[PDB]
Structure formats: structure tokens, C-alpha cells
Coordinates of C-alpha atoms and ligand atoms in Angstrom, one line a residue:
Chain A
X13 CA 0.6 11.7 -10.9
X14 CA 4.2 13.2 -11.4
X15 CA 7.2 11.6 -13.1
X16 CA 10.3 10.6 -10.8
X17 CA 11.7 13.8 -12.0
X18 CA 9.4 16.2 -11.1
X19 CA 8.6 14.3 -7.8
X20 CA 12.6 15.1 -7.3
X21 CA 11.4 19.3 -7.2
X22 CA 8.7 18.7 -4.5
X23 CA 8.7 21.3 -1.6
X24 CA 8.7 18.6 1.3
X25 CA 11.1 16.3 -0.4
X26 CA 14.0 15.2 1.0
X27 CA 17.5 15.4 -0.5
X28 CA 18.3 12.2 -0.7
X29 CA 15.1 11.1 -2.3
X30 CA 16.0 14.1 -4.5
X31 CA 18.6 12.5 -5.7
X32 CA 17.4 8.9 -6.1
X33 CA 14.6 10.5 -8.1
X34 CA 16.9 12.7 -10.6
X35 CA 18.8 9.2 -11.3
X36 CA 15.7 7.2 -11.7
X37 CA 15.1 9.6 -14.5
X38 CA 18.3 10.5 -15.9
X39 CA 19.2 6.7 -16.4
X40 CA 15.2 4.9 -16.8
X41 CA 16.0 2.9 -14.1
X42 CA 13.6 1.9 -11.1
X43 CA 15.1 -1.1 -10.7
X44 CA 17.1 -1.9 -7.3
X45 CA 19.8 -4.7 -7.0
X46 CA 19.3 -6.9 -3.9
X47 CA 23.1 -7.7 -3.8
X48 CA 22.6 -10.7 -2.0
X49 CA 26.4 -12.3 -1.9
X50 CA 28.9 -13.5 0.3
X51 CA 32.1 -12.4 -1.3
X52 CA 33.4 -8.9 -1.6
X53 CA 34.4 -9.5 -5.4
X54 CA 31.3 -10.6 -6.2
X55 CA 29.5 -7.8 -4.8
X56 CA 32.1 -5.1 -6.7
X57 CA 31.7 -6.8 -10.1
X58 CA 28.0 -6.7 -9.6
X59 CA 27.8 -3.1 -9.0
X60 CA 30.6 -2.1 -11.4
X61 CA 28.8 -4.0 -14.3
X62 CA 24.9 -3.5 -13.3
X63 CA 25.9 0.2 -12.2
X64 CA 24.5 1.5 -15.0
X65 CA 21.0 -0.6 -15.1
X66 CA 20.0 0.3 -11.6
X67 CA 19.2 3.0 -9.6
X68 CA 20.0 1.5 -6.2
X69 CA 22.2 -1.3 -4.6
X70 CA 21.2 -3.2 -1.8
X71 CA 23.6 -4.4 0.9
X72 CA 23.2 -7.4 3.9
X73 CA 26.7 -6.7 5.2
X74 CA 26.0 -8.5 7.9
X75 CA 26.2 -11.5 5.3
X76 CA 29.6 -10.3 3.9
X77 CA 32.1 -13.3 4.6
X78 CA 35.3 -10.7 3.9
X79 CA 33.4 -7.3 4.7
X80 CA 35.9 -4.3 5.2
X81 CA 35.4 -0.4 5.1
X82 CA 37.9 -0.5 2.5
X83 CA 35.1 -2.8 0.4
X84 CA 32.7 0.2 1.3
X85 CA 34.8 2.4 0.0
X86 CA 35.4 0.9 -3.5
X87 CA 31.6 0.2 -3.6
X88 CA 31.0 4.3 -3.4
X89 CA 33.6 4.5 -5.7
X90 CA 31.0 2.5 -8.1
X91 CA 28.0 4.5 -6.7
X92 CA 29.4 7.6 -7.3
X93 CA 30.8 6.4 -11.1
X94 CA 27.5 4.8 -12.0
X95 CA 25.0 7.1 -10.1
X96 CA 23.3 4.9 -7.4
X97 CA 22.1 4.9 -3.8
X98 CA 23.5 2.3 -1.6
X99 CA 21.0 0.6 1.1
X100 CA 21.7 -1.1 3.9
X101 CA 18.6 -3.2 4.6
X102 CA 19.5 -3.4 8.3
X103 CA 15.4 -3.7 9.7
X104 CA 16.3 -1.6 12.3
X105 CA 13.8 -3.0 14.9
X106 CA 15.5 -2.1 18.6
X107 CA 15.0 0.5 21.1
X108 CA 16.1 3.8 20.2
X109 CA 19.3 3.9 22.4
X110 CA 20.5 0.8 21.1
X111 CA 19.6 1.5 17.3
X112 CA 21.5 4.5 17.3
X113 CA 24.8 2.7 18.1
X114 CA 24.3 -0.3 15.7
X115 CA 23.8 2.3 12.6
X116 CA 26.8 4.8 13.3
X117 CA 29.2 2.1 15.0
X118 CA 30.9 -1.3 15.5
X119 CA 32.4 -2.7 12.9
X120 CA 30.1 -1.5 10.5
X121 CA 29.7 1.9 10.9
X122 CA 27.1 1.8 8.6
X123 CA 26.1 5.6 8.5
X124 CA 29.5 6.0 6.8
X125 CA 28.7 3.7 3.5
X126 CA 24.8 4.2 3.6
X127 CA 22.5 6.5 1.6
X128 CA 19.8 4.9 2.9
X129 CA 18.6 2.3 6.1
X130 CA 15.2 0.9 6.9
X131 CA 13.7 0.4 10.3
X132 CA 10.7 -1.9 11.7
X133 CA 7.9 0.6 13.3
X134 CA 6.8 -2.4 15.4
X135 CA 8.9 -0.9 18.3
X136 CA 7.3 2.6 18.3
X137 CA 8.5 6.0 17.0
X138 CA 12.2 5.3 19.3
X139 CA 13.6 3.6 16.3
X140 CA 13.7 6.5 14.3
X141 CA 14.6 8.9 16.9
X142 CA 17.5 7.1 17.9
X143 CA 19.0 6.1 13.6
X144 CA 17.6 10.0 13.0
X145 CA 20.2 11.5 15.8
X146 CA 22.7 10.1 13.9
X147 CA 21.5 9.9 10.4
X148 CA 20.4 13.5 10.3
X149 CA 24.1 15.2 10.6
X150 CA 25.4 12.5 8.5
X151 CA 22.4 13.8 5.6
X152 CA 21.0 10.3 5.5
X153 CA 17.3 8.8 4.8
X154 CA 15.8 5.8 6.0
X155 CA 13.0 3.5 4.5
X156 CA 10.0 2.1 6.9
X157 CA 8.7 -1.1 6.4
X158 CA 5.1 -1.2 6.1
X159 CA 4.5 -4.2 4.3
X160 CA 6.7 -7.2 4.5
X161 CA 6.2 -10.1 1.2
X162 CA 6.9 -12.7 3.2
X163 CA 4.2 -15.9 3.9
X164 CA 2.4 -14.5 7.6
X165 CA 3.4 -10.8 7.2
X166 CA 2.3 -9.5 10.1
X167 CA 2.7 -5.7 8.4
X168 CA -1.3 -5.2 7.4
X169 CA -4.2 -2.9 8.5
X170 CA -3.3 -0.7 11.2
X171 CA 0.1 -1.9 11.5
X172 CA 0.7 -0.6 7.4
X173 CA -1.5 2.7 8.9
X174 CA 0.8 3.0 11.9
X175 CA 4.1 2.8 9.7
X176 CA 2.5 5.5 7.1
X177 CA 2.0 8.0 10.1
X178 CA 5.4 7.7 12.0
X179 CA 7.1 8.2 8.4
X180 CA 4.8 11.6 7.7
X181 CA 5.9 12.6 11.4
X182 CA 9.4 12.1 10.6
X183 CA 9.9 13.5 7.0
X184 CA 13.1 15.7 8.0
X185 CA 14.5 11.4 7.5
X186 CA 11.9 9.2 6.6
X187 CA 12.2 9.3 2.6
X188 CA 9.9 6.4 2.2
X189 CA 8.7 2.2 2.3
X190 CA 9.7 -0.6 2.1
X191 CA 5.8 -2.1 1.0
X192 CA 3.8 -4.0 -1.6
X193 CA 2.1 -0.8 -3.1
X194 CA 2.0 2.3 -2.9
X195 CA 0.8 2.7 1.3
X196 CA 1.2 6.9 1.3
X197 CA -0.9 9.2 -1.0
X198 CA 1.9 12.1 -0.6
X199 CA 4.0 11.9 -3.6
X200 CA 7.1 12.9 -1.6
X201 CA 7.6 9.3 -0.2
X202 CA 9.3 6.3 -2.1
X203 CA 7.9 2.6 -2.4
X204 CA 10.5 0.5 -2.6
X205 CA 9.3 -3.5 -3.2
X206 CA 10.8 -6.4 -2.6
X207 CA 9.1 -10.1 -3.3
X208 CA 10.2 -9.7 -6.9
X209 CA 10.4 -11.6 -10.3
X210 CA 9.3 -12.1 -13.6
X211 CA 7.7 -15.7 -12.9
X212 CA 5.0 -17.1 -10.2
X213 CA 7.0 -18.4 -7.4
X214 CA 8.5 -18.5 -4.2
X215 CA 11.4 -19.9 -2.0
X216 CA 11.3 -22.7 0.5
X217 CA 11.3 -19.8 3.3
X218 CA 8.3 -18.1 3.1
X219 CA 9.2 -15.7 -0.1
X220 CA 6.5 -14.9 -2.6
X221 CA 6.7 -13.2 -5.9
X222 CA 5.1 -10.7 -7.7
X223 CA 5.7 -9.5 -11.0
X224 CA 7.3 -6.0 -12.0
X225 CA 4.1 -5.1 -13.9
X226 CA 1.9 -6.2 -11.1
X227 CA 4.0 -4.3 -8.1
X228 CA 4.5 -1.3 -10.3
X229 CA 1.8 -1.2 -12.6
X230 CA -1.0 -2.2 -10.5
X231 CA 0.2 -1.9 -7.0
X232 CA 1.4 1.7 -7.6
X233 CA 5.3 1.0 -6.2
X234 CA 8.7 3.0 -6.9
X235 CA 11.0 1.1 -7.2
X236 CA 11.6 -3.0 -7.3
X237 CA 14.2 -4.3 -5.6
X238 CA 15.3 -8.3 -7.0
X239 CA 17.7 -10.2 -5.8
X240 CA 17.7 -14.1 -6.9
X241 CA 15.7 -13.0 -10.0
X242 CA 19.2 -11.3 -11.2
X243 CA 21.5 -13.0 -8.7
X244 CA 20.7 -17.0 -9.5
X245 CA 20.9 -16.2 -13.3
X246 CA 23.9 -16.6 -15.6
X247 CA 24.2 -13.4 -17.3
X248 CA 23.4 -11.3 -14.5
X249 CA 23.5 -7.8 -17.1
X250 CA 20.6 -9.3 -19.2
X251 CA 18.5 -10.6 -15.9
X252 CA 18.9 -6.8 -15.0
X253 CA 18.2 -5.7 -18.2
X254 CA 15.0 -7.2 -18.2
X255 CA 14.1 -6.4 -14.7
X256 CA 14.9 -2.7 -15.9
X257 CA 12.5 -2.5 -18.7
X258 CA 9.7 -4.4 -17.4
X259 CA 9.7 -2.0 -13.7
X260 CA 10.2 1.5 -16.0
X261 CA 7.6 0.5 -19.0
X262 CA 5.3 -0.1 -16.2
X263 CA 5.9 3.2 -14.5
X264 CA 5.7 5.1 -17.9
X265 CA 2.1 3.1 -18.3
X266 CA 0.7 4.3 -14.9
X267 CA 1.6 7.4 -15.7
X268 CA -0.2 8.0 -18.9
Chain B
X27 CA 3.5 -23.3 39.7
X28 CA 6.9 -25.4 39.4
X29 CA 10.2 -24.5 40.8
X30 CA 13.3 -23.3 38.3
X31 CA 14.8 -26.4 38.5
X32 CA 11.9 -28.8 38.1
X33 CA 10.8 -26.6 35.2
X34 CA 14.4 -28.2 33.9
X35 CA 13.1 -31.4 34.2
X36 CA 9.6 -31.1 32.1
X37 CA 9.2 -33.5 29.6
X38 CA 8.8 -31.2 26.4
X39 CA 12.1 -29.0 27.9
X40 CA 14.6 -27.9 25.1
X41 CA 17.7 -28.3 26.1
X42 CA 19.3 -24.8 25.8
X43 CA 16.2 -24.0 28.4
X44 CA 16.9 -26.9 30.7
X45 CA 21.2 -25.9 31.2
X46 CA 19.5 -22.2 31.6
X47 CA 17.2 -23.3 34.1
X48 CA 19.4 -25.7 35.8
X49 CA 22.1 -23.2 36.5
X50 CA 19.4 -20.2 37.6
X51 CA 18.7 -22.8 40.4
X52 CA 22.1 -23.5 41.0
X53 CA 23.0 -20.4 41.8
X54 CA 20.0 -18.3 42.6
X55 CA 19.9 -16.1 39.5
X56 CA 17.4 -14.4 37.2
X57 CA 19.3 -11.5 36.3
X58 CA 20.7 -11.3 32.2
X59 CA 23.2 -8.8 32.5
X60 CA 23.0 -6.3 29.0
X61 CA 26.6 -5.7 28.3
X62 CA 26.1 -3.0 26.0
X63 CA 29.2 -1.9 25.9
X64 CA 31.5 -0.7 22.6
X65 CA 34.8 -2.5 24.4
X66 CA 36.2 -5.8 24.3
X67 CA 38.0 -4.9 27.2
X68 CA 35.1 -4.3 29.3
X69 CA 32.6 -6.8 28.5
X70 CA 35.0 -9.5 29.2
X71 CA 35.7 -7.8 32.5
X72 CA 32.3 -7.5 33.4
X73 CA 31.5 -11.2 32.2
X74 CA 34.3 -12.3 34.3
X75 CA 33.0 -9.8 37.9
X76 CA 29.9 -10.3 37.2
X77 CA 29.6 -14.0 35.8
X78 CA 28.6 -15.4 39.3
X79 CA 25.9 -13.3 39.9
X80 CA 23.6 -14.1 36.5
X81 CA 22.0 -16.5 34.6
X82 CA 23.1 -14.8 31.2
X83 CA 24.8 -12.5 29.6
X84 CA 23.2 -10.3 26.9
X85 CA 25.3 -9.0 24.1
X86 CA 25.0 -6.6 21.0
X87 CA 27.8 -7.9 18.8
X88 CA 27.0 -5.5 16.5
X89 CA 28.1 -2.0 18.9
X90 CA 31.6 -3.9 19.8
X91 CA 34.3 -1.4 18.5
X92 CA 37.0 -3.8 18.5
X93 CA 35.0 -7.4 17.2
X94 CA 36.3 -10.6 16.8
X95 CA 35.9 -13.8 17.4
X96 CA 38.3 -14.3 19.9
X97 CA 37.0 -12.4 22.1
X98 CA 33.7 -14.4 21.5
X99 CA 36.1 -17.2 22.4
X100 CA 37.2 -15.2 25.6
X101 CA 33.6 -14.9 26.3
X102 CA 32.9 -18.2 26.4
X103 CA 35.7 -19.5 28.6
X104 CA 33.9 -16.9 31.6
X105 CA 30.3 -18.5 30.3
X106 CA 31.9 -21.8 30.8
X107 CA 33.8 -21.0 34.3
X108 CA 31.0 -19.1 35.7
X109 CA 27.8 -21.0 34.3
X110 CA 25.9 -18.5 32.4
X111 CA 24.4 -18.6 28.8
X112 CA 24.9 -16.3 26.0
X113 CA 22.1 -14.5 24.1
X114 CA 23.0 -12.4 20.8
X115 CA 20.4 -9.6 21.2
X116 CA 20.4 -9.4 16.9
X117 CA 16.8 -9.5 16.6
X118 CA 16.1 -11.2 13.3
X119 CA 13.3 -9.8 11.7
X120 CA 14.0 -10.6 7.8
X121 CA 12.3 -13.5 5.2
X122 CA 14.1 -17.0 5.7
X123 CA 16.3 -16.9 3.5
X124 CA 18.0 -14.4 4.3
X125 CA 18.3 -14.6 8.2
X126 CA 20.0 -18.1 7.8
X127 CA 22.9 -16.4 6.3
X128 CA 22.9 -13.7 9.2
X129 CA 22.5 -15.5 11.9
X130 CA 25.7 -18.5 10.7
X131 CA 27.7 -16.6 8.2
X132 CA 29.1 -12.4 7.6
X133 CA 32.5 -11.4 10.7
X134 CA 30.3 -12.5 13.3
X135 CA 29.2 -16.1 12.7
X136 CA 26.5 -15.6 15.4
X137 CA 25.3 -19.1 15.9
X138 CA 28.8 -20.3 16.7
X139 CA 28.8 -18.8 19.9
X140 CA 25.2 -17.6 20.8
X141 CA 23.6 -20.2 22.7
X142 CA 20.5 -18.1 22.6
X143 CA 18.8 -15.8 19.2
X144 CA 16.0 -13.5 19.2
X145 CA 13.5 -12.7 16.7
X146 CA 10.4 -10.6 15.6
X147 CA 7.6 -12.2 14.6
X148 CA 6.2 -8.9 11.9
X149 CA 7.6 -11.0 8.5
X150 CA 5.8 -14.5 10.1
X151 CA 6.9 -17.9 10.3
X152 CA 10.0 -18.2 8.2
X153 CA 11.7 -16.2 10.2
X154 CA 11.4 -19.3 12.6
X155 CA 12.3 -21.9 9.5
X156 CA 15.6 -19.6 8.6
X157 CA 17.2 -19.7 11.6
X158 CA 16.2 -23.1 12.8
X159 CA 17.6 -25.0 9.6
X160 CA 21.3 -23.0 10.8
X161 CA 20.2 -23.5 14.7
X162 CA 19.1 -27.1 15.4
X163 CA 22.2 -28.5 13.9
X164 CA 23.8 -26.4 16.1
X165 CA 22.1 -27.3 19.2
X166 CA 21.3 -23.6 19.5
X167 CA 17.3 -22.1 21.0
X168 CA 15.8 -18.8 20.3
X169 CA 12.9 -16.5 21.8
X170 CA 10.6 -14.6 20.1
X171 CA 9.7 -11.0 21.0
X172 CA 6.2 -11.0 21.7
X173 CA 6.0 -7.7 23.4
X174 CA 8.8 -4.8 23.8
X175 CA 9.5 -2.3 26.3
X176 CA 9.6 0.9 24.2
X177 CA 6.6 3.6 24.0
X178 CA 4.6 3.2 21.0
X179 CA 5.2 -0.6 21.2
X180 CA 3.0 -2.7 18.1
X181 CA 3.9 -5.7 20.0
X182 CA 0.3 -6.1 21.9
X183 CA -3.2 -7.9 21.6
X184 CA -3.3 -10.2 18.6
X185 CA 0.5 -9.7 17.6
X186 CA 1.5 -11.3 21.4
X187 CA -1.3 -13.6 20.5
X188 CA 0.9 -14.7 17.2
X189 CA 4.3 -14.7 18.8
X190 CA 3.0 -17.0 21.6
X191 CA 1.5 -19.6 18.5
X192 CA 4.6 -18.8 16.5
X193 CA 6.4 -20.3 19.7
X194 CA 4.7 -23.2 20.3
X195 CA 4.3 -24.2 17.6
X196 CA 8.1 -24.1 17.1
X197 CA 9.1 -25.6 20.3
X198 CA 12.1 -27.7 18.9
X199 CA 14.1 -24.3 18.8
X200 CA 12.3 -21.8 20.0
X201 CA 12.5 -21.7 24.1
X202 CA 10.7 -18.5 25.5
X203 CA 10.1 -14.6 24.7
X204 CA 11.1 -11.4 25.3
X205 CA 8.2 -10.5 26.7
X206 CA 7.1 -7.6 29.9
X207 CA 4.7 -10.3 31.6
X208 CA 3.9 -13.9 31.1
X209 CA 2.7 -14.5 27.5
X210 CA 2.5 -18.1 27.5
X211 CA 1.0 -20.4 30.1
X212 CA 3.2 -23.8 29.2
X213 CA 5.9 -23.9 31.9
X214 CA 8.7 -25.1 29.5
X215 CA 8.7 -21.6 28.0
X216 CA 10.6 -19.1 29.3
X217 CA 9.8 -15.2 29.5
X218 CA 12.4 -12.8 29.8
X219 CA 12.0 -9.0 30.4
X220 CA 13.9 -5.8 29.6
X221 CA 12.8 -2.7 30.6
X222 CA 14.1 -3.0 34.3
X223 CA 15.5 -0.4 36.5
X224 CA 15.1 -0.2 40.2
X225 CA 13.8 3.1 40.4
X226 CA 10.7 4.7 38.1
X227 CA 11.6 6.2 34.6
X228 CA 12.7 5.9 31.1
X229 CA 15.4 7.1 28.9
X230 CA 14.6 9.9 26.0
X231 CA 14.3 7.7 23.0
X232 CA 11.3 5.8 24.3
X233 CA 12.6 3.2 26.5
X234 CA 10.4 2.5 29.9
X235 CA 11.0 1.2 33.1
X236 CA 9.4 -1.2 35.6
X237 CA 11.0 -2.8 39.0
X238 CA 12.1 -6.2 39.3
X239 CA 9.2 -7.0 41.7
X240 CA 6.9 -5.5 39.3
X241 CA 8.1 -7.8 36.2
X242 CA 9.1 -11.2 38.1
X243 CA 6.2 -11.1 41.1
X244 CA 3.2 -9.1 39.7
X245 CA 3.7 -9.7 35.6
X246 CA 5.3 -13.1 36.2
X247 CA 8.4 -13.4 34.5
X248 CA 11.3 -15.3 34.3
X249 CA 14.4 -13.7 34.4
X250 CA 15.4 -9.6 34.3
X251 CA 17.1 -8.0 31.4
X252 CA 19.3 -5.0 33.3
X253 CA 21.7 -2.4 31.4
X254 CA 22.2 1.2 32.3
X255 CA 20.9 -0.1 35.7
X256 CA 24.0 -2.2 36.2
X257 CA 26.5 -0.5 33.4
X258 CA 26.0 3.1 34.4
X259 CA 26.6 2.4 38.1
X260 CA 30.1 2.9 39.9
X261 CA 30.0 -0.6 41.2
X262 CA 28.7 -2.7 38.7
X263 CA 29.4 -6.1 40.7
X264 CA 27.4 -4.5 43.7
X265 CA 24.4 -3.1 41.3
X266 CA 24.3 -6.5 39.6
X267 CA 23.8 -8.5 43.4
X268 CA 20.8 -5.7 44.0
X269 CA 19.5 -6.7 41.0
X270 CA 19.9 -10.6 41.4
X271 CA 18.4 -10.1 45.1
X272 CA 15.3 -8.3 43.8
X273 CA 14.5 -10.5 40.6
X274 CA 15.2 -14.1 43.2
X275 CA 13.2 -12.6 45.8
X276 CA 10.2 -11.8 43.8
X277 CA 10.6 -15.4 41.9
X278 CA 10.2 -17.1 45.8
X279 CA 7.7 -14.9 47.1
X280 CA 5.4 -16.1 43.9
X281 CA 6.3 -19.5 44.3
X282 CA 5.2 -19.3 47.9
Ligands
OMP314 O1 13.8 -4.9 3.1 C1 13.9 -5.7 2.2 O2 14.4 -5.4 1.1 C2 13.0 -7.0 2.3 C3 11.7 -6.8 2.7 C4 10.7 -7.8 2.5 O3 9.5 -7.6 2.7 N1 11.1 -8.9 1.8 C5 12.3 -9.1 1.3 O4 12.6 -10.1 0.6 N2 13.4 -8.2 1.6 C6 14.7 -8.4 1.2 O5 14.8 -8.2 -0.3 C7 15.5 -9.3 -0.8 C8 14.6 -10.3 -1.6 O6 15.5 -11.1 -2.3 P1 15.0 -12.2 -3.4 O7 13.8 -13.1 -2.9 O8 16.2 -13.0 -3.8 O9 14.6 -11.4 -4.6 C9 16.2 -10.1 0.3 O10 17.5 -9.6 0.5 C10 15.4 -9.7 1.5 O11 16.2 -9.7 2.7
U315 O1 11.8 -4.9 24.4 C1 13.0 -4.8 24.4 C2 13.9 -5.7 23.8 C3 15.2 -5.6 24.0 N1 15.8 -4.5 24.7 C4 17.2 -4.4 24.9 O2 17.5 -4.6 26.3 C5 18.5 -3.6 26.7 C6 17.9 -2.6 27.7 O3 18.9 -1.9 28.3 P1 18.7 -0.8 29.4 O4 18.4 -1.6 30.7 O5 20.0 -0.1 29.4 O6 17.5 0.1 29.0 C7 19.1 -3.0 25.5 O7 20.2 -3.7 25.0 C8 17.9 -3.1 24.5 O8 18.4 -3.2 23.2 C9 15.0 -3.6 25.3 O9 15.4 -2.7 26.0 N2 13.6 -3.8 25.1

């Protein structure tokens, strides 16, 4: 097993991941905010104060009550300061000709903001053809979801097996997973792992939780990626804090 | 086998299926137009040419260049004049929580003017719960996608098998499936099918075509989902009657 940073020199690896790796270590941080918020402001002072705490920030626009490409471009701003990916977790999950339009335009234009998208394999290897004509001349990665944490996930067995083989087909833009553990044996790939927090628990919507220790640790994931866990508490620096330390002391434990 | 407009009548009909059903009879439509189209301009012309000749009108919010809701307003005053339903191709496919905010809040406040939501069935159940808490109070129905068009499709065997329970199991909000055959042998559900073109082919990101007589009389089907078929035509009032024609032809001649 290779630390983040050396899994950032890996012949196959793709620049982005690169780069999320080389933050990862430079900052300790495998911890991804699920900014999961309605108001621009409250988005920006998230990022701007839990910039430094995280590695990644994860966007619903589509839930943005007062979205604007002018917020996109003060949330690089704080991407760029801080040193973190931004991810759009879109779920691609259309055809190819009609993904390809909903990623680079609209209202959107989400290959403009977005390090990095994730896609749904359910409708065959199209999906990624179509975000990759776009994403590839914009130097973009996308995730694919493998394994989903919610109650009735449909993402198991062959269906996990099938999203592991269209993402080692497609390296040139497929960086990684959204999953539950690690799904891919080739180190080049991130897990990214959502269904996140420190307690036992779920929501009233079919969310179940898993503990940083237990996803990372055990499971053999990247990256966590929190949302209510940070985003429900008061001081949302210490929740990240503590999200922070538990995700990296488990990486540093796997690795020995 | 029950006509259109006695399968408006049935007792356990949802009412979003019954006004759909009703006003196929009416006017001897199965065709859902796919506006897919990146201008307000010309999805409100076509809605307004074209509104006689379908049942529905299909929309991407998400590719409209110049969005607002206005023009969803404009849209409805056609859907209103010309009796046809609106269905918000979005394709939900996230935990419960989080689709509830996408489908009523963010620019587009879907459920305000979509009578008619999909969703994938991959992250289970809640995905159902989200969107009905936001679309019963709304009076609003939804289909599931129990099997897709595209080449490599995951949406067969026991996955149809779990949209189809999924469905009915859910039959306050959900109405029917995008589906390429019939999935489900209750007659209150409907079955809609992309995938259409009169002539054999595909596109080159995966999507596949089959005839209207193939998908309404041999697969038995409710109602056609046409794009480029229509859209990429000259005359896309005179493409849209071929298309009606073939799907309410092939509807009678399985009736008898
Ligand atoms: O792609 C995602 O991140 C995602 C996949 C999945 O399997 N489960 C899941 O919860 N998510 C997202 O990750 C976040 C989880 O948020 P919390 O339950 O608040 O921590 C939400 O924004 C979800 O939309
Ligand atoms: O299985 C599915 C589900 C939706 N769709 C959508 O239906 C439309 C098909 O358009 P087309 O006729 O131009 O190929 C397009 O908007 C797709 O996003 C499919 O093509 N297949």
C-alpha cells in the first residue's frame, strides 16, 4: 500500500487525481465537505473557513436557491486559496447525448466550476462517453458510483463489478468511486464515501452511517465525504476538525 | 385489454395518470414529444405547433440556455390550451434527502411546474419517499425507469423486477415507467418508451432505436418518447403527425 503522495506519481494516474492526492498529503486531509446548503453565503463561508480542513468540496447546485456563475467563481477563488477539488455530485445517469449537454451547458455549465463529476453506470458505458467529450478538453475527472449507502442500494455484486470495469476502460477520465470500500485493486483509482459520521445512525430517508474508522480503516476508502455530520453542528470548524483527524489517523493506521 | 380512456376510469388510477389518459383519448395521441432543445424560443414554438398532436411534452430543464421560470409559465399556458402534460426528464437517482430539495427547491423549482418526475431505482426506496413527501402535496406523479434504451443498459432481469415492486408498491405517486416493453401487468400503470425512430439505428454514444409498431404493438407500450426523430426534421409538425399516426395505430391494432 502507497501513501496519497506517492499514489500522486503513479504512471496511469490521472492529473486531476494527481492533484487531489498531492493536497491530501500536503494538508492531512481526506476529508470531503458535502456542502449541502441552500444559500450562496452559506456555502462561501463554509469553504472559506473549512478550506483549510478538507481536501474537497462537494456541490448540489441544483439545490442552490441564489446559484450564479459569479458564486462559482468566488468558490474557485476559495479552491484555489485553500487547495481543494470542487465536485459536483450531479449522478450523471442519462444517455450519452443528453449527458453531454447537461455537464457543459444550461444554466449550469458545470464543466466550467467542476474538478470533478460522478455518473451512474446503470445506463451503460454512453454516460461516460458523452460527460468524457466534453470533460476531456476541459482536463476534468469524473467519479463512478459503484456503491450507493442508501437503504435498498441496488449498486452490489455484478452491478459494483460492472462499474469497476467501465472505470478501468475509461482511465484517460474516470479518476475513481463513489463506493463503500475500496471496489478497485489498482491503486490509481480514488474511493470517495459517503454515508458518513462519527455516531450509529441514519436519516428518515433511507441514509445510513458508518464511521470514519470503519469506511477508511476497515473498508479500505479514500476519502469521506460528510455532510450533516459537519453541516447540522454549531461550530462547523471543530465538526470538521474531528471528521479530519479521525478519516487521516485511520488512513495512516492502514498503512502501517 | 382496456381502452385509454377506460384505463382513466380504474378504481386504483392516480390522478396525474387519469388527466394523461383522458386527454390521449381525446385526441388520439401517444406521442411525448422530447424537446431537447437549448432555446426558450424554440421549445415554446414547438409546444405551441406541436401541442395538438401529443399527449406530453418532455423537457430537460437543465440544457435550456436561457432558463426561467417564466418561460415554464409560458409552457404551461400551451399545456393548458392544447391538453398535454409535462414531464421533467431529471432523473432523480440520489438518497431522500437530498432529491426532495432537487426536485422543489435550487432556479428551477421542478415540482412547481412538472406534472410528471422520473427516477432510478439503483439507491432504492427513498428515492421514492424524497420526492413524494415534496410531490403528493403538490398533486404531482412520477415513473420509475425500469429499463433504458442505451447499449450496455444495467436496467434488466431482477433490477426491472425491483422497479416494477418499487412502483407498486408506491402507487399513490408513482404512475408508470420508462420502460422499452410492458414491465408491469396492472393496467393503471403506464409504460412509456424512448428509444423511437421510424427508421433502424442508433446515435454514437449508445443510444438504440426501435419503430413505433415495434414498442406500442409488439412490446406493448403506452405512449412513444420521440426526439431527433421529430427535432432534427425540416417539418417538425409533419414528423410529429407520422409519429402520432404510427404510435395510435399500433395502440388500435392491439386492442383489436
Ligand atoms: O455521491 C454522493 O456523494 C452520494 C452517494 C451516496 O451513496 N450517498 C450519499 O449520501 N451521497 C451524497 O453525499 C451526501 C451525504 O450527506 P449526509 O448524509 O448529510 O452526510 C449527500 O449530499 C448525498 O447526496
Ligand atoms: O432510456 C431512456 C430514458 C430517457 N431517454 C431520453 O429520451 C430522449 C431520447 O431522444 P432521441 O429520440 O433524440 O434519441 C432523450 O431526451 C433522452 O435523454 C432515452 O433516450 N432513453
Amino acid at each position: 500500500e502507497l501513501s496519497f503522495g506517492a499514489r500522486a506519481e503513479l504512471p496511469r494516474i490521472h492529473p486531476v487525481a494527481s492533484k487531489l492526492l498531492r493536497l491530501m498529503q500536503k494538508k492531512e486531509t481526506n476529508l470531503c465537505l458535502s456542502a449541502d446548503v441552500s444559500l450562496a453565503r452559506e456555502l462561501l463561508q463554509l469553504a472559506d473557513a473549512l478550506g483549510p480542513s478538507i481536501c474537497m468540496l462537494k456541490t448540489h447546485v441544483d439545490i442552490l436557491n441564489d446559484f450564479t456563475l459569479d458564486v462559482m467563481k468566488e468558490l474557485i477563488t476559495l479552491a484555489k486559496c485553500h487547495e481543494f477539488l470542487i465536485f459536483e455530485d450531479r449522478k450523471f445517469a442519462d444517455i450519452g447525448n443528453t449527458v453531454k449537454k447537461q455537464y457543459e451547458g444550461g444554466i449550469f455549465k458545470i464543466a466550467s466550476w467542476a474538478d470533478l463529476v460522478n455518473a451512474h453506470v446503470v445506463p451503460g458505458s454512453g454516460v461516460v462517453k458523452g460527460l468524457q467529450e466534453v470533460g476531456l478538453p476541459l482536463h476534468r475527472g469524473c467519479l463512478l458510483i459503484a456503491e450507493m449507502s442508501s437503504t435498498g442500494s441496488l449498486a452490489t455484486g455484478d452491478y459494483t463489478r460492472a462499474a469497476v470495469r467501465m472505470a478501468e476502460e475509461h482511465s484517460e477520465f474516470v479518476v475513481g468511486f463513489i463506493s463503500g470500500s475500496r471496489v478497485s485493486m489498482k491503486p490509481e483509482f480514488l474511493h470517495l464515501t459517503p454515508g458518513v459520521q462519527l455516531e450509529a445512525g441514519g436519516d428518515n430517508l433511507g441514509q445510513q452511517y458508518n464511521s470514519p474508522q470503519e469506511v477508511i480503516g476497515k473498508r479500505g476508502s479514500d476519502i469521506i465525504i460528510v455532510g450533516r455530520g459537519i453541516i447540522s453542528a454549531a461550530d462547523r470548524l471543530e465538526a470538521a476538525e474531528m471528521y479530519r483527524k479521525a478519516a487521516w489517523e485511520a488512513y495512516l493506521s492502514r498503512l502501517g
